[PDB]
């Protein structure tokens, strides 16, 4: 690259030979960059892999940071943790509904079809068509049956879609889905984060503040508050997901987890460590250095088999012990569950819906697909109430005329 001329480069027997051969200078520059790349890689590997010898673990909890509360194995326990959010089993399908709604925004799987349809509905002037298909026409009315209903509803295909287009626009215009050509799977990561960081493109419409930045005052004092108070919970959920996945990636190997989380509803914190499961020590932790940190299956088998088999050396004849250990043995000493098992008591909350699914077999039709849920506010019962109410509305409208 013609840099080794000047007078600052005399005195080296090799720079002069590169003064007369620019190919040599090109080779020199290439090598002088590659060697530095290699040095960076060496040092990065060392700094990544060396701290693994200095990690030691608590020997009571074995690096879990958490022990069990045994009473909760067989108005609750006041000693052991607090329940989590996805423990309320009655709110599962609602949370999943919200999440799949928010996810349908970003989802760019069907991108090409939406793109071709958007381009067709924008231009609407090219018309590079070809020979239309030989059309069979729907049955005339007055033929009652199932096949007739299928064909009749199928043929009314263009006016219904037209009404759909008239009510809701193309999804890219209502901002319902992500933009037109914001992301490209083969461009680069940097360009895609640039395009997505541009105008709140990472946020769905419901949480985009621009949608609301114009009206909020004395009336409720809430709309611009109850939106920044939802976007916050959203971002907390996302960061929690990142933390959980880093823990799983550490546990995929046998490494100790980086994020220590507080105990939960069945566990208490270890009292040797405070719950900090492991640490760094400047002492090299020989068990890792020689590869002896896993315990040889037969040993564990022996230890457990001897733990689950307590031995009685005394005999209840000499020592007048008539009952096994425990309290209140006397009261302990005083239907067809044996034929058809026990009844499961975690699924009563669905009983009602099940009964409906037996009184109305027509609900099992392959054409219908309700939202999903259990309460009178979800799925099946919503459709059923709607059907009965609209048939009653139409019944009352028949007689008035």
């Amino acid at each position: 690259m013609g840099q080794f001329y000047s007078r600052e480069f005399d005195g080296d027997p090799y720079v002069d030979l590169m003064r007369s051969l620019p190919e040599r200078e090109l080779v020199w520059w290439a090598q002088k960059v590659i060697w530095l790349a290699e040095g960076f890689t060496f040092v990065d590997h060392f700094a990544r892999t060396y701290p693994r010898l200095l990690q030691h673990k608590c020997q009571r909890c074995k690096g879990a940071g958490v022990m069990t509360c045994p009473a909760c194995l067989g108005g609750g326990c006041r000693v052991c943790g607090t329940a989590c959010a996805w423990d309320a089993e009655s709110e599962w399908m609602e949370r999943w509904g919200e999440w799949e709604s928010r996810l349908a925004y970003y989802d760019k799987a069907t991108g090409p079809l939406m793109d071709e349809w958007y381009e067709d509905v924008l231009n609407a002037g090219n018309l590079e068509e070809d020979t239309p298909p030989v059309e069979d026409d729907p049955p005339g009315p007055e033929v009652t049956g199932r096949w007739a209903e299928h064909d009749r509803a199928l043929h009314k295909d263009k006016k219904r879609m037209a009404a759909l287009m008239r009510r809701w626009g193309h999804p890219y215009d209502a901002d319902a889905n992500l933009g037109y050509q914001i992301v490209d799977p083969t461009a680069s990561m940097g360009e895609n984060v640039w395009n997505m960081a541009q105008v709140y493109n990472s946020l769905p419409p419901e949480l985009n503040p621009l949608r609301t930045q114009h009206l909020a005052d004395r009336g409720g004092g809430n709309t611009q508050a109850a939106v920044e108070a939802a976007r916050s919970a959203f971002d907390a959920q996302v960061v929690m997901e990142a933390a959980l996945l880093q823990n799983l990636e550490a546990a995929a190997q046998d490494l100790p987890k980086p994020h220590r989380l507080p105990p939960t509803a069945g566990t208490v914190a270890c009292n040797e460590c405070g719950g900090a499961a492991w640490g760094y020590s400047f002492f090299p932790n020989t068990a890792v250095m020689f590869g002896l940190e896993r315990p040889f299956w037969g040993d564990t088998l022996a230890r457990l088999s001897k733990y689950w088999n307590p031995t009685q050396v005394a005999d209840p004849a000499r020592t007048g012990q008539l009952l096994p250990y425990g309290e209140g043995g006397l009261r302990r000493l005083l239907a067809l569950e044996a034929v058809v098992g026990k009844a499961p008591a975690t699924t009563g909350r669905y009983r009602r819906d099940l009964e409906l699914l037996l009184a109305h077999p027509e609900l099992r039709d392959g054409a219908l697909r309700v939202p999903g849920g259990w309460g009178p506010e979800g799925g099946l019962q919503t459709y059923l109430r709607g059907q009965q109410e609209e048939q009653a509305r139409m019944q009352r409208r028949r007689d008035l005329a």
Partner: protein
């Protein structure tokens, strides 16, 4: 009586397409970058009835 969708479309379709449109969402709200009706219904201040009741209570006061 006389819901909203029954006006913009009405006799242009039967009852089949009307129930078709009725079971897909209220009109066009928060998911579609618009403003909800229950969202807009909060931006308005107390109207003259409450203000006059307050003024009469102020006379009493």
């Amino acid at each position: 009586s006389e819901d909203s969708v029954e006006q913009e479309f009405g006799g242009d379709y039967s009852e089949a397409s009307l129930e078709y449109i009725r079971a897909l969402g209220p009109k066009k709200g928060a998911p579609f970058a618009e403003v909800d009706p229950a969202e807009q219904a909060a931006a308005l201040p107390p109207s003259q009835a409450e203000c006059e009741a307050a003024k009469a209570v102020l006379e009493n006061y």
